[PDB]
C-alpha cells in the first residue's frame, strides 16, 4: 500500500505560483491518502512550511548551481528511501533538472503547460539518457520537444488535468452581505492588464446596470482604482474592490457572486478559475478563448461570447441574471463536469503514473550503480 514518494519544485514558495501551490496541494492530499511524501525546494525562509517541505538553498556565458546545493540534493534522494521520485518543471537550469540527473531508477517529470494541463512523462535510463535529458531541458520552452516527447515511441507520457480542491470553493463561507438583491458579478485578476479583458466588462456596464440598476462589480486582483473609477465614468459607483486576497476569500467572494465573467482577450493558460468558479456553484460567462471552450464543454458548462465583444458580453450577463432556472441549469452541468478536476481523481491518474513506473525493492538511487 504505502508509497515514499519525493518531489522537486524548481521555485520557492516565497512567492506564489501555479506550480508551487500544485504541488503543496498535491503532496498534502498523498499524505492524507496514507502515502509519505518529501518535498524538496528552494529555501522559503519568509512563510512557515509544514514539516515534510525540504529546503536546497539557492544559486545560479552558461553556468550551473554550486556544490553545497548538489550535497543537500544527493544528501536527500540517498537518504530519502524513495519508491518514486517526481519532479516538476526540469527546466534547464533548475533544482529539478539537478534532481533529475543525480538520480536514477523510477523517475517522472512533469511540465505544467497550461494552469488545466500538464504532460507527466517517464525519463529514459537506459544509453538515451544523455539525450532524453536535452530534450526534457526544452520541452518547458518548446512546442517541439513536447509534440514528439507525446509522438515517439517506448514514450509514456500523459496528459493529466490540474488539481482543485473543489470542497474548500462549495463549502466556502459567504461574504458578509451576500448574495446582494442588486446580483453581484465577478471580476477576478490584475485589471490593468489589458488581456484580462477588464475594458470588455467596463464597455457593456451601461446595458448591466440599465437592466439590473442594483448591480455591484465585485473585483479581486490588484490594480489602479482611480483610473478604472474614471474610465467607468459615473457608474463608478457600482465597482467594489477587495484588492489581492488569500485564497480563503477568493474562494468566499466566488461563492458568494451571482456570476463569473471572465473576458479574457487571450492568455491560452489561464482556463483553472473557471474551474474554481464552478466549484463554487457559481455560473460562469467567458470569453470564447479555446481554453475556456475546452472547460465549460463547447458551452455546455458555461455562456461563451465572442473575444473583445461588449454587446454580447452584456446580452450574456443580462441574460444569465435575468432569468434563474438557465443560471441553475449551468450551475448544475458545470457542478457535473468539476469533478475531473477534483483532486482525489488527479491523484490518482498521478499515482498511476507511480505505481507504472516503480516496481517491487526497486528504490531511487543516485547515478551511477
Known sequence: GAMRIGMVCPYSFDVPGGVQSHVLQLAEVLRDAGHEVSVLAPASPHVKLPDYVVSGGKAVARLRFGPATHRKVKKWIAE?????????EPNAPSLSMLALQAAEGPIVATFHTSTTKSLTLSVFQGILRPYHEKIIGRIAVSDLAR??????????????????????????????????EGRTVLFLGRYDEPRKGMAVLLAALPKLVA??????????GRGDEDELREQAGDLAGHLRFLGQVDDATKASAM???????????????????????????????????????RVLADGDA?????????????????????????????????????HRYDWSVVSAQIMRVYETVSGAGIKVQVSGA
Open 80 to 88: 530519502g528511501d524513495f519508491d518514486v521520485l517526481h519532479i516538476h
Open 147 to 180: 509534440r514528439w516527447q507525446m509522438e515517439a515511441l517506448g514514450s509514456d507520457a500523459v496528459e493529466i488535468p490540474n488539481g482543485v480542491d473543489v470542497a474548500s470553493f462549495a463549502d466556502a463561507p459567504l461574504l458578509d452581505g451576500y448574495p446582494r
Open 211 to 220: 437592466r439590473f440598476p442594483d448591480v455591484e462589480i465585485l473585483i479581486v
Open 255 to 293: 461563492r458568494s457572486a451571482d456570476v463569473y465573467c471572465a473576458p479574457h482577450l487571450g492568455g491560452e493558460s489561464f482556463g483553472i478559475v473557471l474551474v474554481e468558479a464552478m466549484a463554487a456553484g457559481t455560473a460562469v460567462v467567458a470569453s470564447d478563448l479555446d481554453a475556456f471552450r
Open 302 to 338: 458555461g455562456r461563451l461570447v465572442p473575444v473583445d465583444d461588449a454587446d454580447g458580453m452584456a446580452a450574456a450577463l443580462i441574460g444569465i441574471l435575468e432569468d434563474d432556472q438557465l443560471r441553475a441549469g449551468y450551475v448544475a452541468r458545470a457542478s457535473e463536469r468539476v
